[PDB]
Amino acid sequence: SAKAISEQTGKELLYKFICTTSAIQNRFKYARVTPDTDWARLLQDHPWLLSQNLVVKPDQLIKRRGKLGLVGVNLTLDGVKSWLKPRLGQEATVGKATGFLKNFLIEPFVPHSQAEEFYVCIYATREGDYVLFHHEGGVDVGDVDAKAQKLLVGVDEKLNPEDIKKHLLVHAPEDKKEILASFISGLFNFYEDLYFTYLEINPLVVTKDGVYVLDLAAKVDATADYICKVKWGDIEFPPPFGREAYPEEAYIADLDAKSGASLKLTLLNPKGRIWTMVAGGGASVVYSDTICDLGGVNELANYGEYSGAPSEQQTYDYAKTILSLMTREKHPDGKILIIGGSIANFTNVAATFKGIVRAIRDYQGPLKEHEVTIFVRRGGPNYQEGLRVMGEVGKTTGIPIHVFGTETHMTAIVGMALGHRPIPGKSTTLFSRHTKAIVWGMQTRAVQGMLDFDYVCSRDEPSVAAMVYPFTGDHKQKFYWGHKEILIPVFKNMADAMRKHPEVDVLINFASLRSAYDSTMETMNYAQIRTIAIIAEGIPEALTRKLIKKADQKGVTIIGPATVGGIKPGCFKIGNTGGMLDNILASKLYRPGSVAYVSRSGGMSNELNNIISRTTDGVYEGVAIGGDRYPGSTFMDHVLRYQDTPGVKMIVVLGEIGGTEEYKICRGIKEGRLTKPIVCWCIGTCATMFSSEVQACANQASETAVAKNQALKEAGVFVPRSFDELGEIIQSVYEDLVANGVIVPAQEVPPPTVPMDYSWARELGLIRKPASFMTSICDERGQELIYAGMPITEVFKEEMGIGGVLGLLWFQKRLPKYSCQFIEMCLMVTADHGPAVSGAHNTIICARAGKDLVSSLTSGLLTIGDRFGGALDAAAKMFSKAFDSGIIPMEFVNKMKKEGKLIMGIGHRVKSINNPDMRVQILKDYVRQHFPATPLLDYALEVEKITTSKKPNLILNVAGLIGVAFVDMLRNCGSFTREEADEYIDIGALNGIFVLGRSMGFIGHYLDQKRLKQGLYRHPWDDISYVLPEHM
Amino acid sequence: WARELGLIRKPASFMTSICDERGQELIYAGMPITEVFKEEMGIGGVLGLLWFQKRLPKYSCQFIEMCLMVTADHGPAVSGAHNTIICARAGK
Ligand SMILES: CC(C)(COP(=O)(O)OP(=O)(O)OC[C@H]1O[C@@H](n2cnc3c(N)ncnc32)[C@H](O)[C@@H]1OP(=O)(O)O)[C@@H](O)C(=O)NCCC(=O)NCCS
């Protein structure tokens, strides 16, 4: 939307980005003075104010400050000091609002008269830009709209100087006419390039010295920041002149910019009783109007809404913030919290309500003593399961939770809250049963919903003909016809999709705000598409106007941006309109009706669908034009389209603050263009009973909801007194029409079945599917990596080395430090043993064959087994089986000798006693020094004594030492049961130790062969004995 | 049960085109194994069905088989034969 900016920001933008032939003075010549800043620094870094006269103004968004006495003229430096004292720092009320003053601006003075002051204005409208010039400027203009010279500029064209001369600048002297003609053109160029929507200079001084701007009011489009963020620097949006934003209120605005969700909150008086946290913008407006209509004008405290499919954290923060701001007061009468909302279509009801459960779970102490009663009502995707979660959680906590579902009226909770009710070239047709649609984007949900509509409406032709996703090639995607297989075709470019079926008539775009404009513009180039529905919210207003004008000249109807779309029961739906499957079944939207409605909000359109379904034989078609200020189609367009449809019998109009569209509807009714019975209601009637409204932008009393409702009521429109009676009046008109006989209610036909998504079926807990895999070593699903129950940050904090991580991953145990260090030593010892062994040889051969690291390492590793690399495991098993039996080492040696088995882990080629193996010596020294008990190592050393008595070189090997010491570690460290250690030896933990250790050496060998640039190896023929058969 | 009643959608994560074993008949690329054997499509024909999903002409299948035979082995001195021999002598 459009937001007003400060005077200084507008002035600096004008100075930096102006392009005109006029002489520009006061360029970067201004100073911002603040109550809480160093004055000495201000006159030190910027002393250029010491030369000429100074003018001081307040820069807190003050309108018509000239007559208020806040404008100081002819001030000296000491004069400025004396002038700022009596008003700066405290309250200075204006009109009906109250607020302080903590920001002022000072500029140089120029001597001039009223004849040199002129009024310049530009403001953006649906048809382009209206520019106003007034020669008798200053603060004497008064009424301006019907007095100043007005010129219209169409969308997407330049402003020629001669039009300014002979149609805009008529009452000025020629000498200054020549300069103003170019100055206004440059001003318009600056306005258009920076994406401003409202620019105001009053007054403007022009003289032989140059052009001076005394006061400037600027309203710019925030949504177009991505077009001018580099050209805006650090732009700020000052709040309207009033009470400063609360520290918790601005937190909601901070959440607003986290994602595409809408998160707004405003405060008037925190001392009130009624508090609302209603989901959805339009739903929140309706709820506020309902509460203020029946006696909540002043007792309401907050005004907040949340929509746009907020996530878990966003809704959690919103709820905790609103409750925290709720618990700063004690109300003896009592406290209530109305949270309602319309029927949601895209917002995840379950996630948001789980978030507010988590937010209310810990906010129970500082709320129970404040006697807070919560009234909950909602509908949408996964509403009932979360609703019963609310029921059970509210029963568990104890606070009064009043749960109302879809079956109850939207505003009934408000009625029971205060005790008022006891507590219980366009075309007349756009979509048809044969309509084909192209969905642009990675939006599978839209296609699924449209296709499910095609089934529940008993259509023999899918409404979705193509999918366009530029970042993937032409392919086919899984879907069902009935319950059998179909494939939707997904294309890269729009041209191919348009050509492959030219009968497609409607396109619905789900592209983000960056590419929505370009995609829509390129879609406009094909005459097959007759209706384009834009779903993105946040498109710049100028680009939206360009799209609207191009569609109007192309004859293509538009569903305006910032909406969920529309639904035609029995024929067609746009995007996520109508909600999920069971809501379509409940709202009875799978058969055509006789009454049609038009609105702006998305979810509240589904609420109107529900109201009509409850009180009328069904809906024929409903369209939401969007929340942007310039929707592609207005209310009047859809009203005429419904009027030209014979199937439609009643018209419903449900808008809000903004525009004079209802006056146009009344005018069309009076002169005989509209004849069908019409029920209309303008929400926002409470906007006059609040302090200031932000979520629109009414200018006069004519654009007020109450005035529009009255003008509709006494013009031939069935307007109820409020939204509460809207259902009753609609039902009464339906009864009158069926009593007349124009409407013949057809009998119901049962809808067919359509399959349900597995993921959201699994979320509801409706399906059991057994897990095919079981893991226990690592968890990566959470926000932190987990190693056997131990977080990675805790792994590194505890200084668990490679051995500690190995223990966690292989044994799921927190091993003692000496165990981890012994594991690392074992890895170091087995790291490599030269290139001559089988595994190193195979790795070297594969590396010299040009293969990558993985293939060479793998080729080497696959030799590890019984003859190579299996000595650790064999030695451990042999010594463990000997020691577990009662046999003494001598008996073990004799028993091995009898069976013709060499004791695995004994015997070295060159090392003997009085010539120790150094690797064995290091490992054995560490094991003796640090291990608590080494029974198997003692047994193996006795066996070594015997075998060395037999023959000197029969010493305990590296393999035997590592095996027996690893058995001792697993068995006598206190982390394993004896059965656990036995199982870990049995399943091959020592094979893993050897393989992981020798992988280092094998990778080193691969890197060495690559670095040495060794060529392909072929074994010599003379080293091979060829003994082949002679004839066989 | 839900899949049998056809009220649950879960997309398949794998796609295949060469062999179907679910049915009463083993099928190589849309051809039953009985028809594979009764039409004398040997190693080459099965290879064409499984690798290219085509019924190659008879001479193509025989040429594929001849290519397999000529590359069957080239002595123990080459790298792959050397590694296979060494891994075999390691008891694997
Ligand atoms: C194919 C190509 C490698 C020919 O190689 P070459 O250098 O002519 O000969 P080789 O590499 O076979 O070996 C040369 C000698 O080593 C001998 N030799 C080959 N393998 C041996 C082994 N395992 N032990 C001992 N000697 C061997 C050969 O008998 C030959 O002996 P000679 O010098 O007495 O004739 C060469 O032309 C080329 O690079 N061509 C590119 C096309 C290609 O790469 N084709 C792949 C081959 S199917």
Side-chain angles (χ1 to χ4, degrees), chain A residues 1-762 764-816 818-890 892-1031, chain B residues 1-3 5-57 59-92:
Chain A
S1 55
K3 301 169 154 144
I5 62 167
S6 66
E7 292 180 353
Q8 155 177 13
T9 316
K11 296 224 181 161
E12 67 182 1
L13 282 154
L14 182 62
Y15 296 145
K16 292 187 286 185
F17 294 99
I18 191 166
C19 176
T20 179
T21 61
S22 163
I24 300 298
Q25 287 71 60
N26 297 295
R27 185 175 183 268
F28 308 106
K29 181 67 174 66
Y30 57 68
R32 185 177 65 246
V33 310
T34 305
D36 291 331
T37 180
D38 201 89
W39 294 97
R41 189 267 298 164
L42 189 150
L43 304 98
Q44 181 54 231
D45 202 60
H46 182 286
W48 290 272
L49 80 167
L50 273 64
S51 293
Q52 69 274 16
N53 191 357
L54 189 150
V55 179
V56 62
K57 294 181 177 67
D59 204 340
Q60 296 226 319
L61 271 164
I62 320 292
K63 187 180 289 293
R64 321 190 52 88
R65 66 179 65 88
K67 277 75 69 178
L68 295 174
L70 281 73
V71 175
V73 65
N74 290 318
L75 278 72
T76 311
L77 295 174
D78 290 331
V80 173
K81 297 295 289 183
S82 297
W83 187 95
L84 272 297
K85 297 294 187 291
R87 45 184 56 86
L88 187 153
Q90 69 274 16
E91 180 65 27
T93 77
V94 59
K96 63 93 176 178
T98 178
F100 296 82
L101 293 174
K102 301 295 186 291
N103 204 65
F104 283 72
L105 189 151
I106 60 171
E107 70 273 15
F109 185 43
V110 60
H112 66 279
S113 52
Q114 184 62 256
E116 293 83 4
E117 292 179 353
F118 309 79
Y119 160 90
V120 173
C121 185
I122 308 178
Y123 61 93
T125 77
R126 181 182 182 94
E127 52 273 1
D129 293 318
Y130 290 166
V131 305
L132 320 178
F133 155 69
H134 193 272
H135 58 271
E136 185 67 25
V139 293
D140 199 39
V141 288
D143 187 9
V144 167
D145 292 331
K147 182 174 73 174
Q149 297 293 321
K150 184 181 288 292
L151 162 74
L152 188 152
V153 176
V155 168
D156 192 74
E157 76 210 355
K158 300 289 94 175
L159 173 56
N160 48 330
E162 67 273 16
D163 273 357
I164 317 168
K165 292 189 287 184
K166 65 176 70 66
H167 289 349
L168 186 151
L169 197 71
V170 176
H171 295 285
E174 191 275 331
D175 291 331
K176 294 188 286 185
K177 183 149 302 202
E178 184 63 86
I179 194 66
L180 292 174
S182 170
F183 174 93
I184 296 169
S185 173
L187 190 152
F188 186 79
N189 284 255
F190 160 77
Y191 168 90
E192 183 178 1
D193 291 331
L194 276 297
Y195 272 82
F196 283 93
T197 65
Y198 184 52
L199 191 151
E200 173 64 28
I201 294 163
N202 173 266
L204 181 65
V205 179
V206 66
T207 306
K208 183 67 180 294
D209 312 317
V211 295
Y212 293 164
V213 181
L214 316 176
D215 195 318
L216 190 151
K219 278 176 69 98
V220 72
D221 197 323
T223 61
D225 68 328
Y226 75 101
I227 314 182
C228 300
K229 66 184 289 184
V230 177
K231 291 174 71 175
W232 285 358
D234 172 274
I235 186 161
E236 294 294 328
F237 295 117
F241 185 21
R243 185 175 177 87
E244 298 95 289
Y246 290 61
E248 284 162 316
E249 183 175 344
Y251 186 39
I252 294 316
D254 210 315
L255 273 72
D256 192 0
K258 298 287 97 175
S259 301
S262 178
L263 297 172
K264 277 74 175 175
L265 189 150
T266 294
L267 305 185
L268 272 56
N269 52 2
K271 309 277 203 84
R273 185 181 68 188
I274 304 299
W275 283 75
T276 59
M277 183 278 288
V278 172
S284 58
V285 179
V286 173
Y287 264 98
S288 297
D289 278 283
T290 305
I291 62 172
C292 298
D293 192 0
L294 57 86
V297 176
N298 44 35
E299 64 183 2
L300 179 61
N302 78 327
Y303 180 76
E305 68 273 17
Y306 76 95
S307 83
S311 60
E312 181 68 25
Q313 184 66 41
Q314 298 186 59
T315 182
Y316 179 76
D317 291 331
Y318 198 96
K320 65 94 175 179
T321 298
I322 188 57
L323 292 175
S324 65
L325 182 62
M326 186 66 204
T327 186
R328 272 82 197 272
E329 65 181 2
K330 180 69 175 177
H331 204 306
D333 192 5
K335 295 178 177 298
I336 75 166
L337 182 63
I338 299 295
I339 59 170
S342 296
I343 300 299
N345 303 268
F346 199 46
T347 81
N348 290 318
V349 162
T352 61
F353 282 92
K354 277 156 187 156
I356 68 168
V357 170
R358 293 180 66 188
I360 64 170
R361 199 176 289 291
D362 56 338
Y363 290 64
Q364 291 181 87
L367 292 174
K368 253 182 175 151
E369 277 76 1
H370 295 268
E371 63 183 1
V372 54
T373 300
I374 292 163
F375 298 109
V376 300
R377 198 273 186 174
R378 194 54 165 131
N382 190 359
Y383 64 92
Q384 68 275 17
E385 191 275 332
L387 191 65
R388 57 90 173 173
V389 178
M390 294 296 172
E392 77 196 322
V393 174
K395 298 288 97 175
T396 299
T397 59
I399 61 170
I401 289 293
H402 288 77
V403 172
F404 269 22
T406 302
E407 70 274 15
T408 306
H409 292 88
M410 183 177 177
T411 48
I413 62 170
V414 174
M416 66 182 180
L418 281 73
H420 294 88
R421 182 175 291 172
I423 297 89
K426 292 175 175 51
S427 313
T428 174
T429 186
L430 304 179
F431 315 117
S432 65
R433 287 180 39 98
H434 318 282
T435 288
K436 276 189 166 296
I438 286 176
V439 179
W440 201 108
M442 72 291 291
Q443 183 62 255
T444 301
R445 280 82 65 194
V447 173
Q448 290 180 356
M450 293 177 70
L451 189 82
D452 276 29
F453 207 58
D454 291 331
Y455 295 103
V456 73
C457 299
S458 296
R459 287 179 39 160
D460 296 338
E461 182 65 26
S463 57
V464 177
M467 185 180 288
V468 174
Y469 185 74
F471 296 100
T472 57
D474 289 355
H475 60 284
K476 296 185 181 304
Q477 186 198 339
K478 181 68 67 68
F479 276 99
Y480 276 171
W481 183 241
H483 67 267
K484 62 94 174 179
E485 177 64 27
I486 59 170
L487 294 174
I488 182 160
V490 187
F491 295 85
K492 174 188 262 284
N493 308 103
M494 275 69 81
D496 292 330
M498 301 270 183
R499 186 177 66 246
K500 61 96 177 178
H501 292 99
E503 70 274 16
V504 177
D505 60 357
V506 302
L507 181 134
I508 305 180
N509 190 0
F510 278 95
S512 68
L513 58 91
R514 280 84 66 193
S515 296
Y517 169 79
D518 293 330
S519 65
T520 310
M521 183 278 288
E522 182 183 7
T523 300
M524 295 296 172
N525 288 342
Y526 305 88
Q528 37 187 300
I529 303 299
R530 307 315 305 167
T531 304
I532 303 178
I534 307 173
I535 315 300
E537 165 167 326
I539 303 178
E541 282 159 37
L543 299 177
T544 301
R545 293 179 293 171
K546 294 181 184 292
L547 290 170
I548 289 176
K549 184 178 184 293
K550 203 213 190 174
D552 290 4
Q553 67 182 357
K554 279 307 191 152
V556 176
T557 61
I558 302 295
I559 302 299
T563 195
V564 69
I567 184 173
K568 187 174 181 179
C571 300
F572 191 79
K573 67 181 287 184
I574 295 175
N576 312 302
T577 309
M580 65 182 179
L581 192 61
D582 57 60
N583 180 283
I584 297 299
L585 299 178
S587 296
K588 302 298 291 295
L589 296 169
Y590 52 92
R591 38 149 194 80
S594 289
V595 299
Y597 72 88
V598 66
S599 179
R600 295 191 145 268
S601 178
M604 183 278 288
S605 66
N606 215 356
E607 183 66 27
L608 213 62
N609 260 341
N610 181 31
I611 292 146
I612 297 180
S613 68
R614 293 181 293 173
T615 73
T616 303
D617 71 326
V619 176
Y620 184 90
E621 184 178 2
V623 174
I625 60 175
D628 285 351
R629 186 178 67 189
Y630 308 134
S633 59
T634 62
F635 279 152
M636 183 278 288
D637 292 331
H638 297 292
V639 168
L640 289 182
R641 183 177 62 83
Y642 292 164
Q643 176 71 45
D644 298 2
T645 288
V648 177
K649 316 302 177 184
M650 182 179 72
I651 301 319
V652 178
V653 180
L654 207 60
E656 69 272 17
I657 301 298
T660 77
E661 194 73 17
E662 290 77 359
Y663 294 99
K664 186 182 286 185
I665 299 305
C666 284
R667 186 154 47 250
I669 285 181
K670 292 182 183 292
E671 58 92 20
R673 181 66 179 86
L674 313 176
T675 61
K676 304 180 183 181
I678 298 182
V679 175
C680 170
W681 174 249
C682 301
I683 69 160
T685 62
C686 65
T688 58
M689 294 182 286
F690 278 64
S691 296
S692 179
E693 293 293 328
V694 178
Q695 181 62 256
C697 312
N699 297 22
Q700 71 274 16
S702 178
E703 296 197 0
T704 301
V706 177
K708 293 187 286 185
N709 289 318
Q710 295 297 109
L712 278 152
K713 183 175 174 66
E714 61 264 13
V717 178
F718 309 76
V719 181
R721 52 148 290 202
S722 59
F723 191 76
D724 192 359
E725 293 84 3
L726 185 59
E728 280 85 344
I729 191 167
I730 279 155
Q731 188 163 21
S732 66
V733 179
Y734 168 70
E735 295 167 327
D736 292 331
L737 291 151
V738 301
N740 183 333
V742 65
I743 289 178
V744 182
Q747 196 54 22
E748 294 294 328
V749 178
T753 189
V754 62
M756 174 190 180
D757 270 25
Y758 165 76
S759 54
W760 174 90
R762 185 70 178 271
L764 306 197
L766 292 180
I767 299 298
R768 294 182 296 175
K769 194 181 179 216
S772 294
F773 286 94
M774 185 180 288
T775 178
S776 67
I777 70 167
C778 179
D779 198 345
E780 82 282 38
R781 305 170 302 176
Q783 61 87 29
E784 203 178 26
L785 189 65
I786 299 304
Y787 279 173
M790 176 159 207
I792 192 73
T793 48
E794 186 66 26
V795 165
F796 277 95
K797 187 265 183 181
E798 294 294 328
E799 280 139 2
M800 294 177 71
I802 299 298
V805 166
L806 187 145
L808 283 170
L809 288 180
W810 297 15
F811 316 117
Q812 287 72 244
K813 302 293 175 58
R814 176 70 181 273
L815 285 168
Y818 66 90
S819 286
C820 311
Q821 186 176 2
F822 166 74
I823 288 178
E824 291 172 70
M825 293 177 70
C826 283
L827 293 173
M828 276 178 264
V829 179
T830 62
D832 200 55
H833 207 249
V837 297
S838 306
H841 201 66
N842 280 22
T843 289
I844 287 169
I845 297 320
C846 197
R848 290 181 58 163
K851 303 307 293 290
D852 60 356
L853 190 140
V854 167
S855 292
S856 315
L857 169 68
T858 290
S859 189
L861 287 184
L862 281 149
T863 51
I864 296 180
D866 70 323
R867 294 179 183 176
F868 175 68
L872 272 61
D873 205 77
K877 283 182 177 175
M878 185 180 288
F879 282 88
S880 291
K881 183 173 74 175
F883 186 80
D884 290 332
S885 65
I887 61 171
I888 56 170
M890 191 42 105
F892 169 58
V893 179
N894 280 338
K895 189 263 187 181
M896 275 315 93
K897 166 165 176 207
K898 187 179 290 293
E899 324 188 321
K901 293 181 177 67
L902 294 176
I903 303 178
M904 285 285 312
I906 291 172
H908 193 193
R909 63 178 177 87
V910 66
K911 296 294 193 182
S912 81
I913 62 170
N914 73 14
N915 183 36
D917 183 348
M918 287 324 323
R919 277 182 308 154
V920 167
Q921 204 57 49
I922 293 153
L923 285 167
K924 182 174 72 176
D925 287 348
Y926 184 85
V927 165
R928 291 292 183 185
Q929 182 143 41
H930 292 86
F931 279 31
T934 54
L936 193 60
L937 170 69
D938 277 330
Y939 189 87
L941 292 177
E942 295 295 328
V943 176
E944 181 182 2
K945 290 182 181 180
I946 286 146
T947 57
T948 300
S949 70
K950 294 192 162 191
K951 187 176 181 181
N953 64 289
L954 310 179
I955 61 170
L956 201 52
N957 283 338
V958 173
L961 180 63
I962 280 168
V964 308
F966 209 89
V967 165
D968 279 337
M969 186 207 69
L970 289 172
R971 185 175 292 173
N972 317 100
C973 70
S975 297
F976 305 84
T977 303
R978 160 71 90 91
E979 284 68 44
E980 283 176 341
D982 274 11
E983 184 178 1
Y984 272 120
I985 302 284
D986 183 278
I987 65 185
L990 269 166
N991 293 342
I993 279 293
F994 181 86
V995 170
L996 190 66
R998 198 47 63 95
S999 290
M1000 294 182 286
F1002 286 178
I1003 297 169
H1005 278 301
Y1006 164 87
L1007 298 176
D1008 184 50
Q1009 298 307 308
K1010 287 303 170 177
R1011 214 200 59 258
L1012 294 173
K1013 294 180 182 179
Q1014 295 295 77
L1016 171 79
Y1017 168 83
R1018 207 193 155 101
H1019 199 71
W1021 278 335
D1022 60 358
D1023 206 346
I1024 309 159
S1025 296
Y1026 290 75
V1027 298
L1028 279 73
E1030 291 82 3
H1031 186 271
Chain B
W1 184 259
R3 297 291 294 165
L5 294 174
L7 73 165
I8 295 298
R9 293 178 64 88
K10 184 174 74 68
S13 290
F14 289 91
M15 280 178 68
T16 46
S17 296
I18 72 165
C19 180
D20 199 341
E21 85 281 22
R22 306 171 297 176
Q24 289 291 315
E25 185 69 26
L26 187 64
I27 295 169
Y28 290 165
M31 190 156 157
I33 191 70
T34 71
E35 181 195 5
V36 165
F37 272 102
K38 66 95 175 179
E39 282 183 315
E40 293 179 353
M41 293 177 70
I43 299 296
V46 166
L47 187 143
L49 286 172
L50 287 182
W51 294 16
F52 317 117
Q53 287 152 245
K54 299 291 165 30
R55 277 208 53 169
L56 314 161
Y59 65 90
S60 296
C61 312
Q62 317 306 342
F63 171 74
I64 288 179
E65 282 177 84
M66 302 183 45
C67 290
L68 291 180
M69 308 150 63
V70 296
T71 61
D73 193 0
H74 203 252
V78 295
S79 290
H82 187 66
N83 296 115
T84 286
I85 287 169
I86 284 184
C87 200
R89 293 180 59 166
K92 301 307 295 288

